[model samples]
Target: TIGPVTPLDASDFALDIRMPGVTPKESDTYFCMSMRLPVDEEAFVIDFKPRTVHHMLLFGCNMPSSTGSYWFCDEGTCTDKANILYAWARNAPPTRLPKGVGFRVGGETGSKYFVLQVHYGDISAFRDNHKDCSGVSVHLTRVPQPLIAGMYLMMSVDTVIPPGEKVVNADISCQYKMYPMHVFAYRVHTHHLGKVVSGYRVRNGQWTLIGRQNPQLPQAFYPVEHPVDVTFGDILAARCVFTICNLYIMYYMEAKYALSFMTCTKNVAPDMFRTIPAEANIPIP
Candidate 1:
C-alpha cells in the first residue's frame, strides 16, 4: 500500500507560466504534492516485508513529444494533456524510478516569479533515500520566467498519416509573457527519432534564427545557444518540427509515430509561464 500520497490543487497553490506582458491563455500548469518516506521503514513495510518502491506520478499536459511513462506516464492514465505536467522520480529503466512529480498550470495577472525548477533523484533508479530524514521533502520549485523568448527550427521532415486519420502538427506554438534579459542557454529536447530542433526570434515581421540542437537528450533538460536579451511585454514564440529517420535502430517502437520538439530556458520559474490561448484570428508577431 502507498504509505503517504498527497495531491496538489491549482486553485489553492497554482503557479503562473509566463512573465509580465506575455500571457498564454493556457500554458502547462505544474502541480506538486509533497510527502516524506517513512523513517522507520516499518511504516512503509508491507506485511513486515520491505517492498521496493516502483514509481509515482505527477499531473501534466499531453504533448506530441512523449507517450506517458517511456514518453508520458508509466502505469497511470490522464484525461487531458493540457491540464497537468507530471514528473517521475527516475531516469533510464533498471536504474530510474519516480522521485518528485507535479504539473504546470497556466496563470493570470501577478503570479509567483524568481523560482528555480530543481529536481534531485537517485542515480541508480532506486527511490532517493539520501535525504537526512527517512521521508523526502518534495520541493516543487518553479522555473523562472524567460527574459528573452522565441521559436527556432532545427530541422523539418515530412511523413504520411494513415487514411482518414487526423495528424497533430509536429510543432506546438505558445506565448510566454516574460523578459529574458540575459539568457544562459536555449535547449531543444526530443525523442529517439528526433532530427532537428531549431529556435528563432521574430521581431517586427523578421524571423531571426537563434540556434538549433541535434539528437535530443532524453528525460533531461539541455541548453541551446547563447543568452539573449528580451524585454517584458515582448511576444515570444517557438515551434518544433521533426523528421522520420533512423527508426529501425534509434526509435523502432516510437518510429511508427512522428514527434515534435521542446525548448528549455535556463531561468524560468515553473509558475510564471502560462499557455497562450489558441487563436487563429490573432497573427503571431
Candidate 2:
C-alpha cells in the first residue's frame, strides 16, 4: 500500500517480482526470467530494493518459445534483441516515468511477455540467513500517451585496463540519427573499481555537460542541469576513469518531452568503497 498504486476505473496493473529465497554462492551471479501481463499497459513506476540487487533490466518480448508461462536464461544477457524496455542499477530509486509518457507493453503494438535480468553480487553475507526477496515492482496504466519514452545505454564495452595499473580511461560516443528528441535525465553506473563517469552532448562543434558523478555513489537517477535538444547530427558521448583494472560502466539517459521543469532526487554522498583498492584488482567478468 505504500508503493506505487494502480488507478481505479482505469485499465491499470502492477507486477511484483522476487526470488525463491534460495541461498546463492558468494560470487557475481546473473539471473534471468520472464513474466506475462494479463493486459496491455503503459509502465509508470519501478519500485525495488537494492541491498542485494546490483542491477535489473526489463525487456518486453513477444510470446516466448517456452510453453510454460515463465522461463529462465542461462546468462545475464538475453538473446532477444527487440525486447529492451527498462533498467535499474546501483541502488537506483523507484523511477517514475515522466507525466503522460511510458513504455507500452502487452498491446497490439507492444509485447506480450517480459524478460527480467538481474545481477546479484557478493552474496557471502547472506549465506546463513539469506532472506533476499528483492525484485522490481512495475506499475502501469492502460491509457496511452502522446509520446513514448525510451532508454539509451552508453558505455565502452571493448575497453580494457591492465591489472595493477594506477589509472586508466575509456571513452565511448553515440551519434543520434533519429528524429529530434529531448534528453531529460541521466544515471551513472559502475562496479567497485570505477572512479568517475560523466556524460555529454556534442552539438554544433560544442560540448555540453549533461551530468557527472562518482560511479560508485548510490546511483540514483538525476535530472540533467538542463534538458538538451538533440538532433540527427548530434553526438552523445561518455567517459569513464578507472583505477587498478577493467572497469565496465553504463550511463542511462531518459528522453521525453512536454516537461515544464527539471527535477531529480537528492544525491547520496560517496562512501569508502568509492575508491578501488590494489588488492581487489581482479579482472571484471
Candidate 3:
C-alpha cells in the first residue's frame, strides 16, 4: 500500500461489490462480476480487500454481462472494447482521485454496467474448500465531474522467453488519438522476472520521461511528479526491463475514454518482445 486508506465522504454514496461463491483449484484463475449504476454518476474512490484479491480490475461497459457471478473472461466479456476505471494488485491501498477529478459512469458516458475482474493467484484457500468473496468498494457522486478519469493499458502480448536469458525488454507504444487528457498517476506491472519499467511521452520524435519504477514494489498508482497534459498525436511509449520476464502498464489520466494497445513479448534486443507489429504498436488507430 503506497498510502493510507481514507474513509468515504459523508455526502457521497457507495456500492459494495464482491465475487460470488467460487473456489479456484489452480493459480492465475480469474472470476468476474458486474454492476449497473442506478443513475448517472461519477466515482472518485476505489478500495479492495487485501487477503483474497490477488489482482482486480474495474471496467466500464456499454451493455450488460450475458453471464455473471463466477464467469470467466476474455475480450468477449464486454461490448467490444472496454474502458478501465480502476485496478488493484499487490495489496495496494485505496485510491482517491485528485480534487475535482473522477470517472463518469452511466447515462451518456456509455458505461451502463461496470464489470469486476478478480484474479486468484493463491490456491491455498481453495485447498481448504474456502469460497472467495473478495470485497471491492466504490464511492461515488450523483453529478458528473470536471475531469473524467480512466486508465489506458499498454500490454506485452504473445510473449515467449527462454529460461537462460539475462536481459529482455518489452517496448510497447500507443499513438494517442483519443480525448486530450492530463496524466495524474502511473503504475507498472509485470511478473517476477521484471526488473525496471519506464515510460515516455514522445512528441515530434522527442521523448520526455513520464514515470519509472522497479515494478517489484507495491503495485499502486503513484502521483506523477510533474504530470503533463498529453494531447492528440502524441506518442505514449512504455519500455520494460526484464530477464526472461513480463510487462504491463497503466496511465491514471484525465480522459473521457479508455482502450488498450499491444506490444510483442519477444525481444528485438531492445524491443526483445514486440507485442504488436513495428509499424502498428499503436493502441488506437
TM-score of each: 0.31, 0.61, 0.64
The better candidate by lDDT, 1 or 2, is 2
Regions more than 4 Å wrong, model 3: 1-12, 26-28, 40-51, 63-66, 73-79, 125-129, 155-180, 189-196, 203-206, 213-222, 232-234, 240-285
lDDT against true structure, model 1: 0.27
Tens-place lDDT per residue, model 3, 200-248, is 6667766666667777776666667776667788777766666622333
Model 2 clash number: 0
Model 1 poorest 10 in a row by lDDT: 42-51
Output the worst ten-in-a-row residue range by lDDT, candidate 3.
276-285
Candidate 3 TM-score to native: 0.64
TM for candidate 2 is: 0.61
Runs of candidate 1 exceeding 4 Å displacement? 1-77, 82-137, 140-193, 205-211, 224-241, 244-285
Candidate 2 lDDT (Cα, 0 to 1): 0.54
Estimate, for each residue in 1-285, the C-alpha lDDT of model 1 and write its tens digit: 232333234312222221112111221322122212212111100000111122223222322232321221222233322111222233422111122212122232111111111222323434234221111222232332211111222222343334655322233322433433332234344565455544444444444444444535333222333444433443334443343321100000111121112232222221222332223112222
Residue-wise C-alpha lDDT for candidate 2, range 1-285, written one tens digit per residue? 433344444665667655444445556776666666766543433223322677666666674444432334453333444345555767555344556456656545566766666667667654776745555667666555555555556645666779779767666565666665566566676677687776666676566766677766544466665667666777665666777211121222332432212121211111312332322233333
**lDDT of each prediction vs. the true structure?**
0.27, 0.54, 0.61
Candidate number that wins on TM-score, 1 or 3: 3
Ordered by lDDT, highest first, the candidates read 3, 2, 1
